């Protein structure tokens, strides 16, 4: 009901790896090795030259499933970033990437984006000291995001954290791995992040 | 007659008031002559009241009548305070 | 036309006729059936299409299609009317919604059910 169903499957449809899986989306299982076709009876069948519509729909779906939120919440986003002063594409990206759940992932307190959401929504995180259990929450920059201490020694936490001892973090972010604090310093520009998405095709999808 | 009072601006449960000069027969919530301040009972801000006395005082001089809870706020900003 | 023409005369704003008196303006209207019957369609088709002449709460008597695989109605079956027209028979201007009032649902449709009025069966 949000997405919540098979996934290394829509890795497949969207036609490239997304890492909604974390560990093992880096396996030689991501099912993207073993299976670069789409789901269905027809996955192994020969391509059809897609529709201008098709392509744009697809790009949108991709961006969506990466960030892993509802159409509604996503569109309300785009519309929001559309309205704001600045370049509608990169702002979409700024805003999306400014979601608490996704900050958690990007700070590596969770392995996958969906884990990071459950992490939040179960109370494990705090933004500047008050536990904040909505995943939509907007991280403004200058905000510090920690595992709050009650959870600080629980299993999965120490797992990730003590496994991320040594890693670099995204350059709009900082990490004190001991304290499991992190700061969201600044906003990402397009290639501040990675993404396998021509954002401009999404802008176009909505201009329909 | 002309009255200085509260008019209700919050939401359900999140109750903000405008301090207001009005002819007493208006809806409390309806159109009024001057806004003279705000009052926030739940004290949610640094400033949950503001007045600008010099204005309130003018209306007082013309027989603007503060309700009690009005006048407490007025004198709280010491619109009233003598010297 | 010139501008003094437009100033003099103006442009004619242009209205539209409703494809229905389901009247009021209402989005459905109930009614009872007078005849429930079977009709043939026009040039390119044959079948036996199933329809009811229905007297309505809006006073008007109309013909309504009775969609879907099979059905239950008869002379005094009272039913609700929807609107939507059936290309290729004549003057069927409204559809019967199935599953409201005396109009049953369409038995065994597993597939497009919200339309056709049928209850989700038990996946077992």
């Amino acid at each position: 009901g949000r997405y919540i169903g098979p996934v290394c499957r829509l890795c497949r449809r969207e036609g490239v790896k997304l890492y909604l899986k974390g560990e093992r989306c880096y396996s030689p299982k991501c099912a993207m090795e073993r299976r670069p076709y789409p789901p269905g009876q027809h996955g192994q069948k020969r391509a059809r030259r897609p529709s201008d519509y098709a392509v744009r729909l697809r790009e949108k779906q991709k961006l969506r499933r990466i960030y892993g939120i509802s159409e509604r919440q996503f569109r309300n986003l785009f519309e929001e970033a559309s309205k704001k002063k600045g370049v509608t594409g990169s702002v979409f990206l700024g805003l999306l990437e400014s979601r608490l759940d996704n900050v958690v992932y990007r700070l590596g307190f969770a392995v996958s984006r969906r884990q990071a959401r459950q992490l939040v929504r179960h109370g494990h995180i705090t933004v500047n000291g008050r536990r904040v259990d909505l995943p939509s929450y907007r991280v403004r920059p200058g905000d510090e995001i920690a595992v709050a201490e009650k959870s600080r020694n629980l299993e999965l936490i120490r797992q990730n954290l003590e496994a991320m001892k040594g890693r670099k973090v995204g350059p709009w972010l900082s990490l004190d791995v001991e304290g499991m604090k992190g700061k969201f310093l600044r906003l990402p520009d397009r290639e501040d992040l990675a993404l396998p998405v021509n954002e401009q095709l999404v802008i176009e999808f909505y201009s329909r | 007659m002309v009255k200085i009072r509260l008019a209700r601006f919050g939401s359900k449960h999140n109750p903000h008031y405008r301090i207001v000069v009005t002819d007493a027969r208006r809806k409390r919530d309806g159109k009024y002559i001057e806004k003279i301040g705000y009052y926030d009972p739940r004290k949610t801000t640094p400033d949950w009241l503001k007045v600008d006395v010099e204005r309130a005082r003018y209306w007082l001089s013309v027989g603007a009548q503060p309700t009690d809870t009005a006048r407490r706020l007025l004198r709280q900003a010491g619109v009233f305070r003598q010297e | 036309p010139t501008i003094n023409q437009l100033v003099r005369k103006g442009r004619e704003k242009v209205r539209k006729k409703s494809k229905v008196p389901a009247l009021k303006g209402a989005p459905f209207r109930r009614g009872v059936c007078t005849v429930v019957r079977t009709v043939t369609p026009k040039k390119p088709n044959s079948a036996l299409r199933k329809v009811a002449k229905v007297r309505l709460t809006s006073g008007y008597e109309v013909t309504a299609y009775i969609p879907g695989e099979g059905h239950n109605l008869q002379e005094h079956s009272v039913v609700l009317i929807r609107g939507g027209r059936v290309k290729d028979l004549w003057g069927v201007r409204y559809h019967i919604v199935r599953g409201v009032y005396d109009a049953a649902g369409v038995k065994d449709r597993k597939k497009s059910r919200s339309k056709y009025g049928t209850k989700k069966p038990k996946e077992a």
Partner: protein, 99 residues
């Protein structure tokens, strides 16, 4: 500002009262042209001093009859009867047009 207009007296026929014709122009709010309209104002002349054809300034005044809310201020132009015989020709125009 009691409004004050100006126009032509086309009406002689009244006891202590005159009809002034006041034209206005203005841009038309859609087709953009400027167009030119007018009305007949019923006006107060206590001494019968303004006479046919005069062109007078007209004033917002405290009320006089059903219809006179206007007293005459001053004369501006005297005797231009083109105006008078233009509107007057237009009223003789009327009663073409019917049954």
């Amino acid at each position: 500002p009691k409004k004050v207009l100006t126009g032509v007296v086309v009406s002689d026929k009244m006891q202590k009262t005159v009809t002034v014709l006041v034209e206005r122009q203005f841009p038309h709010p859609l087709y953009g042209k400027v167009i030119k309209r007018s009305k007949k104002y019923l006006a107060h002349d206590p001494e019968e001093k303004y006479k046919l054809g005069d062109v007078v300034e007209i004033i917002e005044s405290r009320p006089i009859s059903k219809r006179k809310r206007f007293r005459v201020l001053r004369l501006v132009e005297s005797g231009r009867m083109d105006l008078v015989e233009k509107y007057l020709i237009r009223r003789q125009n009327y009663e073409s047009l019917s049954k």
